Every structure is written in structure tokens, then in C-alpha cells.
């Protein structure tokens, strides 16, 4: 309770054992102490209890469990709130893993040194580090939300960063020591942490350095390839098998049923989806390029069926979301720009189709709507391209550079508008107010900066009609405008793009590596049929409604669990030993120790020479 | 065989891949614009292979300085104006802004930031060969 | 501010090297003087 880490270590070294010391009563007494630095636990407890706690209330373990569930996320379930613990608590012991509870208590009460001491003692160090990082991040967010002294937030953020760095270093050590056991360590089910895995915990904490590691990337590659052993040449074989079902039987599978394992691989589903989308785009181009008749043709019916099935699939994917409330699921789904754009495009296509099955003017309007709408579906191919290892970061860089382009578009527009207004006002002094005037300002000045310069029309020669007053200023202002637009601003924008490329490239690579996981999970969850013919799959689930062995987790036995725990303990011990050995042999430490020893030696030699036995 | 003209050819060969990685995006944007314009301006056509030619021809020629506003959107004595014929100049302006400002400058930056290592590797391989 | 400046200056590598060199020189001279005596 006094935050004396050295005394705790000394007592541990002198026979004290935490397996017998720690009990429910002692843990509750620890959670209700006051002899330490200030913390924000009571505010969180009050907020969770809807601000109805009595004054000087005593915190129990169920309140701590509720706080942990609130902090961790939506689907997380603390062990305190489970029915077995509630029964054991109402009818009254022991803790199989006391250091888990001790580290959670240290993290919640903001005692970083105690938490760091407790982290290295016990099993499941990496999961504990990830949980601590997530808890610190959530606590920092909560503290910053409700106007604290504004430094607790930065302290909690620093603690979260430290725990994340520890987790990353432990993962690196584990991968460097043994790759297969390291991969097995990232996927086995954690019975003590709400049946989650280290990968899910890292994704929930938005730890990009952990996901972008080589071990995580190769684990994701293995998960994406399914139960197929092909590595040398994929894509072509997958497409051949999709087009030729008999050709499936000539592939090497992992340790009749080959069809089911082949079709359930995420890569096969992705290629099926891509082929269906390409066919739909081809049919859309065909229907928009040729003459339209009174009633829709077969291709138009096919594309309408495709778009309607896609819409109903998007509607059904919003009712399977993690959040509980319906309106809460909608605002969680509406968090990616692609979903919003898809919804808008589907609504616009529906409006155009409704207006199309009518008389000639409404049909023409609907056709124009189709022509405008095809552009979005053409542009959407970049989302499919984002699966390539090289074509994703380029799209991210384009998205990041559009803002810098827009910051110069405004100045270009100002100069262009000034020149256009001046020229139009000078050359046409006998005009009446009309919207045609607002068109001549932007049209030709904009077309002239893309190589469409015509000196015979910027200043017409002036048999000829009489020359306008001051008609010679137009070529001069045109020359100045061209010099400013095509030399200064363009080169400045080129320099801006050139000097801000390295950081954008690195960030794009990191974000793409992080976001591979969501793509893999999305294509693992999806059905085995493309949107044009998912109508079979959308009615089968209805009949089965009234009727994750791998790819998400990995269920393991107890002997292998013991082996994994031993491996993790060896890895963390090796990591700490390497850190200490590197620190002790640095030049700075050697210089400091040599200086101290020289000072002490000089003082002792002076004392020795002080004596005079002669 | 020249001491200076070999590494340059090797650099060209090494940069062709980066050029091809942007050609695809340029083609996507060009094809979208061409399909939109052709569909809007010609609503009474029959299926023919001439349709597959007008998609790429003019949109590709327009990004090399051959811009003609009198043919992207013909004025409309004149034959009646097509329904929604005013969208063509707007999409043309957007297409020009995207093609000739964003992607070209990004490719220039990509070439500029990956020159030192390519130059060194080309010199080493020429000396070896 | 002044205390931080002094603490940073005193713990630099260059100052430690210089002070160690001076102390080693003085110690070597004093040890030579001590060995100069012959009480045996
Ligand atoms: C809003 C859509 C309305 C659809 C109705 C048709 C409208 C006709 C005009 C076409 C407009 C389509 C552009 C929409 C694409 C943006 C999608 C998005 O926001 O994803 C964010 C997307 C992802 O955000 P996140 O996944 O949620 O994190 O960010 C990106 O990386 C997109 C980068 C590429 C966008 C720039 C390239 C677009 C060039 C188009 C130029 C016009 C050519 C015309 C000829
Ligand atoms: C054929 O007969 C048509 C007639 C209606 C014509 O009304 C006129 C009213 C003024 C108005 C709307 C017109 C032409 C130039 C228009 C200017 C262009 C300017 O551009 C902007 C450009 C960008 C800005 C920064 C500066 O101003 C406008 C403030 C400015 C602007 C929109 C002011 C409005 C002007 C049309 C029939 O109606 C009964
Ligand atoms: C004069 O009479 C000729 C007639 C034969 C005409 O047949 C037509 C059949 C459809 C076809 C082949 C024709 C013109 C547009 C063609 C489209 C262009 C599209 O472009 C592509 C462009 C790029 C793709 C991404 C999208 O689609 C095509 C899928 C698309 C495309 C090739 C679909 C095919 C279309 C010709 C005589 O025959 C008996």
C-alpha cells in the first residue's frame, strides 16, 4: 500500500510467496487504500455506477470488473463478473495466477513501477502487456475527456507507449528465437482474458508496430492462403480452379472434401468476387454504350439484380455488428468513406432506375443518371487494387497528396478568375446581364493553361471592326498570367510533392500492413457466393435461423500450453539478460564507473600517504 | 559499351516498372471519362467496334496538349442540345486536373526519390558485365 | 534552470574524461613519490 517496490522485492526474496499471500480480502484491502499517489479510479467507478454511489462508498471486486469491462471494449467480459465468481463471492479464497490480478491493480491505480515489476513475474507476459496498453489508452482517453489536470492524460499515454514497446520487443525476441512457437504464441486461446488472442488484443489497441511485424505478416499470409500449400504461383491457379472445377483436384492441401476446403479459402472468395465485379462492370458499360429501349433488356436486368443484391447484402451486414442498439450500429457502420459512397451511389442508381421506367424525358434523365453513376463504379476498382502489395500504398499516397493539391487550387482559381474577369470586361463593353457572362470567366482561362493557347482569340485583330479602347492590355495580362500559372505555382507544387514523399510513403506502408487484417477477416466472414447470385445464400440463413477452428483462433491442449508457457518464460529471461549485458558494456557506463573508481582510489591513496610511519 | 551510356539504359529499364505501376491508374481514369462522355453525347448508337475505339482515342490524345473545347462539348440553327450535355466540360476539367497535375507530379517524385540506389546498382552491374 | 544546466554539464563524457585524466596524472605522480622512499 506504500508503493515500496524494493521492500516487496526483498520480502519476495526472503520466503514470501504470492500464491499463498494474496486472497480476496487482501486484494479488496489493496483496492481501498489511500497511502499512495492520486489516481482516477473513483471517478471511473462513479461514472460506471451512473453517479449514484453513496458518499465514502467501499469498492468491491464486481465494481472493478465492471470498470474493466467498460474500459476494454464492447465484447470483453471480465472474470470478476462471471457467475462462478459471483457465487463464490456471495457465499463468503485463492488465485491460480496472482500476478495477473496484481498487475491489473497496479495498472488501474497508476503505479507504473509496480506494474513493471509485476509484468515479468508469471505467465502470459505478452497478453498482459497488450491488456495494460489498452487499459492505459482507455484511461487516458477518459481522463482527457473530463477536464483533468491535463498531465494525467500524458502520463497514461506514456505508460501505454512503454507497454506497447515492451510487447513489440518481446514479440521480436520470440520470433528471432523460434518462428513456429512464436506463431503458435500469437493464436492460442486465452482462457483468462475473455477467450481472446494476442492478435485480437493488438488490433483492439490499434498497435500498428505489432501488426506490421514480420511474424504477424507471415501469420496473416498463412491465414489468407487457407488450407492450400501453394506459394510459388498463386492467382493463376486459383482462377483456373474457379473456372475449371475439375482442375481443383491437382493441388497440394494441408494436413470429395477438397471442394469444401478449396472454396472456403479467403483468396478463392476474393477472386470470385473480383470476377463477378468485372463482369458486372462490363455489362454496365454495354448497357450504357448502346441504344436504350422502352423496357430493360437482359443485361440491364442482370445489373439491376447485382446492385439490388449488393444493397441487401450491405443492409444485412449492418444487423450483425458488435454494438447492441440499432441506431448505434448504423453510426458504427457509417465510419468508412467507402460505405457512405456506396450508399449514396446505390440511392442515386435507384432514383435513376425509377425515373427511367417512364415517358421519354424521364427516361432520358434516367439514362443521364446512369451515365453519371458509372463513373463511381469505374473508380471503385482502386479498392480491389488495394490488395496488391505495390498498388495500395500508391493509392494512399494519392489520397494524402490531394490535400496539398487543393491548397494550391485556390490560388490558381484566384489568378484565373482575375484574368478572366479583366479580359471579358475589356473585350465586351456592350453586354446585358445574363448567366452566359458567368461562364466566359472560367472556361477559356482554364482551358488555356493545358496547352490550348490561341492568340487569334485572346486578342482578335483590330475592313476589320474598330479596335476596342485599350485592347492591347489583353496580350500583356495573358503573358503575365501564363508566366505565373505555368512556371511558378506548378514548380512550387512539384517541390512540395518532392520534399514530403518519404514520410508519406512510410506511413502508407505501415497503414497498409495494419489494414491487411481487416481485409482478411472480412473475406473470411463473407459467404461463398458472389453478389450477383447471393440470393441463394440470403434465403438459406433464414431457414437455418428458425432451424472458428482456424482463421480466428487456435484451440490447444494442456501439455502444449505448458510448453508454450515455458518457451515464453525463456524468451523473456533471454530478453532481460540481453538488455542488461548490452547496458553494462556501453562506453558511457564504463566511463562513469572508471571515474568513480578513480576518485575513490585517489582519495584512498591520499589517505594512505597521509600516514607517516618513518 | 560507352562508359556513360550503359548505366543510363539500365536506369531506364529499372524505371519502366514504376512507370507501368501508374499506367494502370491513368488508364482507369481515362476509361471512366471516355465512357461517360461517349455515353452522354451519343444516345442513338448501334453495337459496333467503333464504340470501343472512341473510348480511348480522344481522352488519350487530350492529355498530351491536344485539347479542343470545340469537340469535347460541341455548341448546342444548331441541332438541339442533348440532355445533360453540360456535364462533359466539368468532368473534362476534373479529368485534366487529376491526370496532368496529381499523377504526373507523383511519378516525378517517385523517380526523384529512387535515383541514388538505382544509379549505384547500374554502375556496379555494368562494371561486372 | 541553473541547477539543471550544472547537472547536465557535470555528467558529460568530456568533463568526466578530463577529470579522470587529471586525477590519474596526480595519482601517478603521488605514487611515484611514494615509491621514491626506501624505508627498507
Ligand atoms: C460520393 C459518390 C457519389 C457517386 C455518384 C457518382 C458521382 C460522379 C463523380 C464520381 C465521384 C467518385 C469519387 C468517389 C471516390 C472516393 C471514395 C472514398 O472516399 O474513399 C476514401 C478512401 C478510404 O478511406 P477509409 O478506407 O475509410 O480509411 O481513401 C482513399 O484512399 C481514396 C484515394 C483515391 C481517391 C482519389 C482518386 C479519385 C480520382 C477521381 C477523379 C474524377 C475523374 C472523373 C473523370
Ligand atoms: C437572359 O436573361 C437572364 C435574366 C437573369 C440575369 O440575371 C443576372 C443577375 C446578375 C448575375 C447573377 C448575372 C450574371 C453575372 C453574374 C456574376 C458573375 C459574378 O461571379 C461572381 C463570380 C465569382 C465571385 C468571386 C464574384 O462574382 C458573381 C458575385 C457574380 C456574379 C454571380 C453576380 C451575379 C451576376 C445574371 C432573366 O432573369 C429575369
Ligand atoms: C457493324 O456491326 C458489327 C456487329 C458486331 C458488333 O458486336 C458488338 C458486341 C458488343 C461489343 C463487343 C461491341 C461494341 C462495344 C463493345 C464494349 C466495349 C467494352 O469495353 C470494354 C472496355 C474495357 C472494359 C473494362 C469494359 O468493357 C467491353 C467488356 C466492352 C466491350 C468490349 C463489350 C463488348 C461490346 C460490338 C456485326 O456482328 C454480327
Amino acid at each position: 500500500v506504500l508503493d515500496r517496490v524494493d521492500f516487496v522485492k526483498l520480502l519476495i526474496e526472503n520466503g514470501v510467496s504470492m500464491h499463498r499471500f494474496l486472497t480476496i480480502s487482501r486484494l479488496e484491502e489493496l483496492y481501498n487504500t489511500r497511502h499512495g499517489p492520486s489516481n482516477t479510479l473513483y471517478h471511473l467507478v462513479r461514472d460506471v455506477k451512473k453517479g449514484n454511489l453513496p458518499p465514502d462508498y467501499r469498492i468491491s471486486l464486481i465494481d472493478i470488473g465492471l470498470v474493466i469491462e467498460y474500459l476494454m471494449g464492447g465484447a470483453y467480459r471480465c472474470n470478476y463478473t462471471r457467475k462462478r465468481f459471483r457465487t463464490l463471492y456471495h457465499n463468503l479464497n485463492h488465485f491460480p495466477f496472482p500476478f495477473h490480478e496484481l498487475m491489473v491493480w497496479a495498472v488501474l491505480m497508476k503505479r507504473q513501477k509496480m506494474a513493471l515489476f509485476f509484468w515479468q513475474h508469471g505467465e502470459e507476459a505478452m497478453a498482459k502487456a497488450l491488456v495494460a496498453c489498452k487499459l492505459c489508452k482507455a484511461m487516458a482517453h477518459e481522463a482527457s475527456e473530463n477536464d483533468m489536470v491535463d498531465d494525467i492524460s500524458q502520463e497514461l499515454n506514456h505508460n501505454s507507449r512503454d507497454f506497447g514497446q515492451l510487447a513489440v520487443e518481446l514479440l521480436d525476441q520470440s520470433y528471432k528465437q523460434d518462428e513456429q512457437l512464436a506463431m503458435k504464441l500469437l493464436t492460442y486461446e486465452l482462457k483468462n482474458w475473455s477467450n481472446a488472442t494476442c492478435l485480437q488484443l493488438a488490433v483492439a489497441a490499434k498497435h500498428r508496430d505489432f501488426i506490421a511485424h514480420t511474424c504477424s505478416q507471415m501469420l496473416l499470409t498463412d491465414m489468407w492462403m487457407g488450407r492450400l500449400r501453394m506459394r510459388k504461383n498463386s492467382g493463376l491457379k486459383v482462377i483456373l480452379g474457379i473456372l475449371l472445377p475439375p482442375s481443383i483436384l491437382s493441388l497440394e492441401f494441408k494436413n470429395g472434401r477438397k471442394i469444401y476446403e478449396f472454396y472456403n479459402a479467403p483468396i478463392v472468395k476474393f477472386w470470385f468476387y473480383t470476377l463477378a465485379y468485372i463482369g458486372y462492370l462490363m455489362l454496365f458499360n454495354y448497357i450504357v454504350l448502346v441504344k436504350m429501349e422502352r423496357w430493360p433488356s437482359t443485361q440491364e436486368w442482370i445489373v439491376i439484380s447485382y446492385i439490388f443484391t449488393l444493397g441487401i447484402e450491405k443492409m444485412r451486414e449492418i444487423l450483425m455488428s458488435e454494438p447492441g442498439k440499432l441506431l448505434q450500429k448504423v453510426k458504427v457502420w457509417l465510419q468508412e468513406y467507402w460505405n457512405v459512397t456506396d450508399l449514396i451511389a446505390i440511392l442515386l442508381f435507384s432514383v435513376g432506375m425509377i425515373l427511367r421506367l417512364q415517358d421519354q424525358p424521364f427516361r432520358s434523365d434516367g439514362r443521364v443518371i446512369y451515365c453519371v453513376n458509372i463513373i463511381y463504379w469505374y473508380i471503385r476498382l482502386l479498392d480491389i487494387f488495394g490488395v496488391n502489395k505495390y498498388l495500395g500504398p500508391y493509392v494512399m499516397m494519392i489520397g494524402k497528396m490531394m490535400i496539398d493539391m487543393m491548397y494550391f487550387v485556390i490560388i490558381m482559381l484566384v489568378v484565373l478568375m482575375s484574368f478572366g474577369v479583366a479580359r471579358q470586361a475589356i473585350l465586351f463593353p456592350n453586354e446585358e446581364p445574363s448567366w452566359k457572362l458567368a461562364k466566359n470567366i472560367f472556361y477559356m482561362p482554364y482551358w488555356m493553361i493545358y496547352g490550348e493557347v490561341f492568340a487569334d482569340q485572346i486578342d482578335p485583330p483590330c475592313q476589320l471592326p474598330p479596335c476596342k479602347t485599350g485592347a492591347w492590355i489583353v496580350p500583356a495580362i495573358m503573358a503575365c498570367y501564363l508566366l505565373v500559372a505555368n512556371i511558378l505555382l506548378v514548380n512550387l507544387l512539384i517541390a512540395v510533392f518532392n520534399n514530403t514523399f518519404f514520410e508519406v510513403k512510410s506511413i502508407s506502408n505501415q497503414v497498409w500492413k495494419f489494414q491487411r487484417y481487416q481485409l482478411i477477416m472480412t473475406f473470411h466472414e463473407r459467404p461463398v457466393l458472389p453478389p450477383p447470385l447471393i440470393i441463394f445464400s440470403h434465403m438459406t440463413m433464414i431457414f437455418q435461423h428458425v432451424c472458428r477452428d482456424y482463421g480466428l483462433k487456435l484451440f490447444i491442449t494442456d501439455d502444449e500450453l505448458k510448453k508454450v508457457h515455458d518457451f515464453e518464460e525463456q524468451c523473456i529471461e533471454e530478453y532481460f539478460r540481453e538488455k542488461d549485458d548490452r547496458f553494462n558494456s556501453s562506453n558511457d557506463e564504463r566511463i562513469r564507473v572508471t571515474s568513480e573508481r578513480v576518485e575513490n582510489m585517489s582519495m584512498r591513496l591520499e589517505e594512505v600517504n597521509e600516514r607517516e610511519h618513518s
Side-chain angles (χ1 to χ4, degrees), chain A residues 1-488 490-614:
Chain A
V1 300
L2 288 176
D3 195 7
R4 299 289 197 268
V5 185
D6 285 359
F7 278 95
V8 171
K9 186 180 306 176
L10 178 66
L11 291 176
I12 281 187
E13 290 181 348
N14 289 268
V16 179
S17 178
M18 295 299 183
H19 295 74
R20 332 189 78 262
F21 160 80
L22 187 58
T23 51
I24 300 178
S25 303
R26 284 195 172 97
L27 189 58
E28 286 209 7
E29 293 183 25
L30 290 177
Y31 264 106
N32 296 267
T33 187
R34 292 290 180 174
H35 307 162
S38 60
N39 51 87
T40 66
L41 179 60
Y42 195 86
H43 302 134
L44 296 175
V45 174
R46 192 193 76 263
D47 296 4
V48 170
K49 302 297 285 297
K50 305 301 170 59
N52 302 330
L53 35 65
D56 56 82
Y57 175 67
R58 178 175 179 86
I59 301 180
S60 59
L61 291 184
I62 301 182
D63 311 332
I64 294 302
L66 293 180
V67 170
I68 293 176
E69 292 184 5
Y70 173 77
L71 287 178
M72 280 302 303
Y76 191 87
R77 282 280 302 185
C78 183
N79 210 327
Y80 294 155
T81 58
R82 293 190 178 271
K83 296 302 164 296
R84 172 173 178 83
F85 187 86
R86 291 203 178 191
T87 53
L88 193 144
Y89 185 79
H90 168 50
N91 298 128
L92 182 58
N93 182 82
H94 230 49
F95 286 109
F97 306 92
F99 285 101
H100 293 17
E101 280 71 13
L102 286 185
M103 185 189 184
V104 170
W105 163 79
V107 168
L108 281 180
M109 302 202 68
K110 218 183 80 64
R111 301 187 180 184
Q112 177 77 347
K113 189 179 182 181
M114 193 81 68
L116 290 178
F117 167 74
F118 284 153
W119 168 74
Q120 58 177 351
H121 292 67
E123 304 90 6
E124 307 178 13
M126 193 159 54
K128 284 159 57 181
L130 297 177
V131 169
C133 175
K134 174 58 184 180
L135 287 181
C136 292
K137 184 186 185 65
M139 290 174 61
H141 166 63
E142 283 289 343
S144 182
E145 182 199 15
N146 289 14
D147 52 278
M148 290 296 182
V149 270
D150 302 330
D151 40 358
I152 305 180
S153 303
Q154 77 174 4
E155 294 184 359
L156 294 172
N157 289 323
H158 291 194
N159 298 8
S160 178
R161 295 204 310 264
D162 293 1
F163 280 113
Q165 182 63 30
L166 282 176
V168 170
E169 293 180 346
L170 187 61
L171 171 64
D172 201 329
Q173 182 77 36
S174 297
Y175 172 77
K176 187 166 54 185
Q177 184 166 340
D178 193 0
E179 302 179 1
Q180 287 294 147
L181 285 177
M183 295 220 308
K184 184 191 298 296
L185 181 58
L186 292 172
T187 52
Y188 82 100
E189 191 177 20
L190 302 168
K191 304 296 182 179
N192 301 273
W193 302 106
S194 178
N195 294 271
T197 63
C198 295
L199 209 58
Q200 300 180 27
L201 295 176
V203 170
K206 301 184 182 302
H207 204 353
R208 279 171 167 81
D209 304 329
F210 195 91
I211 302 298
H213 198 269
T214 304
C215 181
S216 300
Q217 290 304 314
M218 63 186 300
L219 176 65
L220 284 176
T221 298
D222 295 356
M223 189 181 305
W224 165 267
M225 205 58 58
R227 303 230 61 85
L228 305 180
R229 209 186 307 272
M230 55 179 68
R231 293 301 190 280
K232 48 97 182 179
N233 180 23
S234 299
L236 297 179
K237 296 207 294 292
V238 179
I239 291 178
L240 177 59
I242 291 178
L243 299 181
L244 281 74
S247 180
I248 299 176
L249 307 182
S250 63
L251 304 177
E252 44 272 3
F253 285 72
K254 298 180 179 177
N255 302 90
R257 301 291 291 184
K258 283 190 174 183
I259 307 299
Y260 179 81
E261 292 289 345
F262 174 83
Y263 275 80
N264 287 267
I267 173 178
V268 180
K269 304 179 179 181
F270 166 74
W271 282 116
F272 219 168
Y273 192 96
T274 303
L275 295 183
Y277 185 83
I278 291 182
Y280 155 76
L281 195 60
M282 297 185 170
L283 289 176
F284 211 153
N285 289 31
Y286 183 86
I287 68 166
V288 302
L289 279 180
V290 303
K291 178 176 59 182
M292 177 173 296
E293 226 62 34
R294 176 62 187 92
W295 294 114
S297 181
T298 301
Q299 301 82 2
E300 188 167 349
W301 285 123
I302 297 179
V303 304
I304 287 177
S305 62
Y306 176 94
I307 192 61
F308 171 80
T309 49
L310 180 64
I312 65 179
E313 209 285 333
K314 293 300 179 180
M315 186 180 64
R316 93 146 190 85
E317 88 173 9
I318 210 176
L319 304 182
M320 209 255 304
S321 302
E322 177 61 37
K325 234 301 177 181
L326 189 271
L327 295 182
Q328 175 63 214
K329 292 184 297 181
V330 178
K331 62 180 301 300
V332 169
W333 186 77
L334 291 173
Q335 289 173 353
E336 301 91 5
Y337 307 145
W338 284 115
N339 298 331
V340 183
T341 52
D342 290 328
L343 180 65
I344 296 177
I346 289 181
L347 292 183
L348 192 59
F349 184 88
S350 301
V351 171
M353 183 199 65
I354 291 301
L355 209 60
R356 178 252 186 271
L357 281 76
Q358 282 184 6
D359 204 2
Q360 188 60 254
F362 306 92
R363 175 147 47 97
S364 301
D365 298 1
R367 191 181 185 273
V368 175
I369 290 182
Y370 282 173
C371 299
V372 175
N373 188 269
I374 200 182
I375 301 180
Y376 171 79
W377 305 111
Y378 251 104
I379 295 299
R380 186 176 162 86
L381 281 173
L382 306 183
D383 185 66
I384 297 181
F385 285 171
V387 185
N388 186 274
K389 186 160 56 64
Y390 301 95
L391 283 174
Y394 284 154
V395 176
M396 309 203 67
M397 295 172 203
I398 295 174
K400 291 183 172 60
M401 297 296 183
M402 287 203 64
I403 309 177
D404 282 327
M405 194 183 66
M406 293 302 179
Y407 270 147
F408 284 78
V409 168
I410 302 178
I411 311 175
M412 193 276 300
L413 284 180
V414 170
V415 180
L416 178 150
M417 208 183 310
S418 62
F419 166 75
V421 169
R423 189 199 76 91
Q424 220 287 337
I426 288 186
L427 283 188
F428 298 94
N430 295 122
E431 292 291 337
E432 301 295 334
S434 177
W435 295 100
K436 186 64 170 57
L437 300 178
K439 178 186 177 182
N440 300 20
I441 302 301
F442 305 94
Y443 210 72
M444 290 304 176
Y446 186 82
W447 297 133
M448 283 162 195
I449 56 178
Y450 289 104
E452 200 226 25
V453 176
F454 284 87
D456 211 340
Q457 304 177 14
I458 65 178
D459 187 11
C462 53
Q463 177 182 358
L464 301 181
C467 175
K468 298 298 193 303
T469 304
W472 47 268
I473 316 177
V474 178
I477 63 179
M478 175 60 176
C480 297
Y481 164 69
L482 282 181
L483 180 63
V484 171
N486 282 331
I487 294 300
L488 189 60
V490 176
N491 292 13
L492 194 62
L493 184 62
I494 289 180
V496 169
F497 279 9
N498 195 280
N499 285 86
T500 63
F501 182 80
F502 194 86
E503 52 269 25
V504 172
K505 172 187 180 63
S506 57
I507 294 176
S508 303
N509 285 272
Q510 291 294 282
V511 176
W512 180 84
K513 289 184 177 183
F514 176 80
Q515 291 186 0
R516 283 190 58 191
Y517 176 91
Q518 182 63 25
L519 165 81
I520 292 182
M521 290 306 174
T522 293
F523 271 101
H524 184 58
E525 183 273 341
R526 269 174 174 170
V528 210
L529 287 183
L533 52 151
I534 47 180
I535 187 62
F536 298 112
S537 298
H538 276 181
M539 51 80 57
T540 47
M541 73 171 188
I542 299 299
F543 292 164
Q544 306 306 131
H545 177 244
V546 299
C547 180
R548 306 291 194 182
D549 294 329
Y550 193 73
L552 188 54
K553 297 174 177 58
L554 184 144
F555 308 93
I556 210 63
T557 177
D558 296 358
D559 225 1
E560 306 295 332
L561 189 65
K562 194 73 61 181
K563 294 183 55 58
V564 166
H565 291 359
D566 300 355
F567 177 77
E568 190 174 12
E569 290 183 337
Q570 183 184 193
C571 291
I572 187 178
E573 178 181 343
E574 176 65 26
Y575 157 81
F576 270 107
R577 171 151 42 250
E578 285 190 359
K579 172 193 299 301
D580 293 1
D581 286 4
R582 283 216 316 271
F583 174 76
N584 278 335
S585 63
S586 60
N587 281 332
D588 322 331
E589 186 68 23
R590 288 176 173 174
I591 291 179
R592 186 196 64 85
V593 174
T594 302
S595 60
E596 286 192 359
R597 289 173 176 171
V598 163
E599 176 182 357
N600 283 267
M601 187 190 311
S602 180
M603 181 265 298
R604 185 149 303 277
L605 186 53
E606 183 73 15
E607 290 180 340
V608 167
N609 192 30
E610 188 269 351
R611 81 161 65 176
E612 296 284 56
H613 64 270
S614 301

